[PDB]
């Protein structure tokens, strides 16, 4: 009946080039998504409870 939730610090990486403050923010979150599309959806966490 338990529900164990695991969290682990992960260093993200952004591409060289793109400017503009808004565009950088979208990329910071794009990195959060690419992490989920390689570790998240395959283990357990949903698209709803996405941290950060």
């Amino acid at each position: 009946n338990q529900v164990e939730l695991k969290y682990e610090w992960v260093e993200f990486t952004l591409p060289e080039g793109n400017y503009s403050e808004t565009m950088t923010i979208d990329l910071m979150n794009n990195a959060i998504v690419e992490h989920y599309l390689k570790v998240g959806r395959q283990n357990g966490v949903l698209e709803s409870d996405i941290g950060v």
């Binding site: 989920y36 599309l37 959806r41 698209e47």
Partner: peptide, 13 residues
């Protein structure tokens, strides 16, 4: 249908 794999990207419509 498979059952477990949501590309997570509104491809539709």
């Amino acid at each position: 249908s498979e059952d477990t794999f949501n590309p997570v990207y509104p491809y539709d419509t």
